[PDB]
Design a protein around this ligand. Sequence first.
Ligand SMILES: CC(=O)NCC1(c2ccccc2)CCOCC1
Ligand SMILES: CC(=O)NCC1(c2ccccc2)CCOCC1
Ligand SMILES: [Zn+2]
Ligand SMILES: [Zn+2]
Ligand SMILES: [Zn+2]
Ligand SMILES: [Zn+2]
Lengths: 360, 360
Amino acid sequence: MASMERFLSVYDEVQAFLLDQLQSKYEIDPNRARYLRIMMDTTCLGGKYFRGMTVVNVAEGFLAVTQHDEATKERILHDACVGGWMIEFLQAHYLVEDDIMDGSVMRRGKPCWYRFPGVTTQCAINDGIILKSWTQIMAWHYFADRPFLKDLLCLFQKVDYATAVGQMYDVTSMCDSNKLDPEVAQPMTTDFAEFTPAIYKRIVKYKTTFYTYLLPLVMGLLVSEAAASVEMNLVERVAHLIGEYFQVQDDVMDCFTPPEQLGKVGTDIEDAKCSWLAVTFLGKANAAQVAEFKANYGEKDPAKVAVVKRLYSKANLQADFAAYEAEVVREVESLIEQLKVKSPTFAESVAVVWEKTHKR
Amino acid sequence: MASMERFLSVYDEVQAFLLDQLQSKYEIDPNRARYLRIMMDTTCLGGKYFRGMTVVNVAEGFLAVTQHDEATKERILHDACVGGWMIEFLQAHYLVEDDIMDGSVMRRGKPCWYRFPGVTTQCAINDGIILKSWTQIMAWHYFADRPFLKDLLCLFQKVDYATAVGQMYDVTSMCDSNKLDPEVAQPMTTDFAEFTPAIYKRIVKYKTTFYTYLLPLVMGLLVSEAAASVEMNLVERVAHLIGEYFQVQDDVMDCFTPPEQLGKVGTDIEDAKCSWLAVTFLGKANAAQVAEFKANYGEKDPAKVAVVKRLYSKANLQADFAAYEAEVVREVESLIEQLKVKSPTFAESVAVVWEKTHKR
Ligand SMILES: CC(=O)NCC1(c2ccccc2)CCOCC1
Ligand SMILES: CC(=O)NCC1(c2ccccc2)CCOCC1
Ligand SMILES: [Zn+2]
Ligand SMILES: [Zn+2]
Ligand SMILES: [Zn+2]
Ligand SMILES: [Zn+2]
């Protein structure tokens, strides 16, 4: 059976489980079950399933080189699909809550969930809570007797927590650290002293790379009982590397990809985000360029947003991007090699992850 | 050592752990650590610690009747304090997120967290996420080697999920079920057909009673390795009973307790909540009273809120309350007796929980 159709079929299975349990154990009524069904579909479906399918791909790699009974291959593939959905539902939690946090309008060409007329923020914050709760109910039901249950739960736990901390670094990235204070309304930085490569790197490492690249790779290893085929420090290294590259691309598209292709209107400039563009610009600007950027960044006024786009265009940031790209291609290819030693399969799965990132 | 000072000391210990880990493992800087410290204190401290201290009380009960080395009594009491904080931090998550959901202003006489000038909703939704995340980091660190880790995690999981589902029943309690629809903006009910005792009971059972009464009692049993001293169906029964009574009292105070004593301005009438008062009123009103209530409920206009308070005052709902009270006192005393058989200690702890509820 093809991997994607397996994955999709398991979504239907998990959804039926979750809603049937709500009816048998949690006293839900049919209309609320239907609300939750629609919420799950709307928030979990319609992407490429990169994260979830990476767990399945990693597990298919090890199945090709490991001896098992057919029924055991099916159990492993079923566990990889459930684990993959746990990651998709965790991503759905963070996208629902982020969208509300940031006052986002669209995502992928459709309204953010909280904007649906019969949802509202009051319901959508708790719908997002529920999405994450569902990842735990999946794991305790499907993996109850599994040897990897504890490891999987503990890993998922740490990744969730890293992601929340990274949301904390992201939402505070335009403030001066020494001024953070719950008592005092937060001004936007004026010096931009914290728009540096290492600070940027910390934001992206925690906000994105743990759930998007580390978790899928590691969950694939866990459902396969294959953590001995890797040096886990290397898998963490490659995950954070590839995932930083991913975000650098998202930062560039927020500014430069037309909103119909982007699936939303990018507001990183108005939101004064610490993007790769801002940091890279400041790393090469002269005194007058720095002044013009300070006078214009983090302002809704479209004339001022156009002055920042203008400054970036004229700064040749394409060249710094090609150079970054080159260096990542170099370091990922090195880490692939290091992974090839203990596991060719796993190294190939990493290679595929890299190809799907580097191409898009 | 006195229980409360033990409990409080463990808060300092856990907080230092959590923030020190953020510095050693999650690359946090001092200013963000301080933000999180203040957020933890503000959101977790200043209540009566009923929930957390109930875990400690239950564990002290069993220590009096069970043979142990002193070092084992200290480990049990330390585990009961950590478990108690897990419940306090879980409550803190739900109060932060609820407050944002409901557009609340104050709680306990102080501004809701999201209203602090240097917080904002954008940060506060993720601060609430973090609060819950912290309950998992506590459990995996402090209870890593414990025989009860799996049971405790699985119980906490189910209780969290029940609470989220109960938030779903609460926020939708003024809508007609058959009209729930993410696509369509939700009208307030006009018939009030769903303001019934069993529907009310479902809302309160899930929103409050699992985390406030079941979890503390059960967590006390788990850290004590004492689940064999109870019939768990009875402990669930008594928890939901006592916790319904609790909420009936909160529903009556929302309407009738002056805001300086209440610690907030009650808006259940304007919010069209399915409160005990509304349900009990509708259960005894004549045709003209029902019409006047429909014409006035769920409206911000203070004149219309005063007409509902008026209708409730004249309906003698005090009498229905005394009758409810009587019947709960009766059924709790029966369940205490049933618990006394397998465990006098545990039955006494339940008795104390009941006294602290029934008195307040
Ligand atoms: C510095 C750094 O890389 N921290 C991430 C840690 C991690 C690893 C893997 C998944 C989630 C969290 C934090 C907890 O301890 C292990 C490292
Ligand atoms: C009908 C009812 O009481 N449901 C609550 C359940 C529960 C029990 C204890 C803690 C959390 C959840 C739901 C899951 O299965 C067990 C019953
Ligand atoms: Zn965001
Ligand atoms: Zn972006
Ligand atoms: Zn609420
Ligand atoms: Zn209330």
